[PDB]
Amino acid sequence: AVSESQLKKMVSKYKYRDLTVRETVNVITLYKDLKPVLDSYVFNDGSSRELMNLTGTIPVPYRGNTYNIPICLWLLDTYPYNPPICFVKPTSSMTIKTGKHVDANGKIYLPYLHEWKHPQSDLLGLIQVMIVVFGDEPPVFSRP
């Protein structure tokens, strides 16, 4: 958590903040799992900006079981890619056996993403598809 005053203060730099908050509010509102985060990073070789990421865990049942597959998201102010990037975050105990879209970088190489032409696509769906893809095949895996 980071209150609404501090949360905004963190995304106060963002240009599409109002748009970001909206997406988030929904993301969370829809799923009370993805928590808002804020992480800064340099640029080029000196510059630095503030970018917020969405880290959480979604319940992925399998064979009547229950799994916890985490996911991290990246946001931007406007550029380069207006739309945020989706990617799975690997753990230390578990492993990442990639997936149909889950690349080696845990990035979602979905065909709907690359060709995401909002409002056609959205975060809700971006997460939905996963719930399915993952709900069918765990891209995490950890059975050596």
φ, ψ for residue 7 (rounded to 5)?
Answer: -60, -50
Amino acid in the structure at residue 6: Q
Cα(27)–Cα(32) distance, integer angstroms: 8
Nearest 5°: CA angle at 109, between 86 and 126? Answer: 45
Q: CB of 114 within 8 A of CB of 108?
A: no
In the sheet that 35-43 helps form, which strands lie side by side, from edge to edge? 35-43, 47-62, 65-74, 85-87
| CA-wise closest residue to 20 among 3, 44, 36 | 36
User: Which class for 58: exposed (0-12), middle (13-18), buried (19 or more C-beta within 10 A)?
Assistant: middle
Left, alpha or beta for 64 (phi > 0: left; psi -120 to 50: alpha)? left
**What ranges do the domains of the chain cover?**
1-144
Q: Method used for this model?
A: NMR
HEC per residue, 12-47? CCCCCHHHHHHHHHHHHHHCCCCEEEEEEEEECCCE
48, 30 Cβ separation under 8 angstroms: no
CATH entry 3.10.110.10 includes domain 1-144: yes
Length of the chain: 144
Asked if residues 141 and 88 have their Cβ atoms less than 8 Å apart, the reply is no
Give the list of residues 6+ apart from residue 14 with CB closer than 8 angstroms, or none: 20, 50, 52, 75, 76, 77
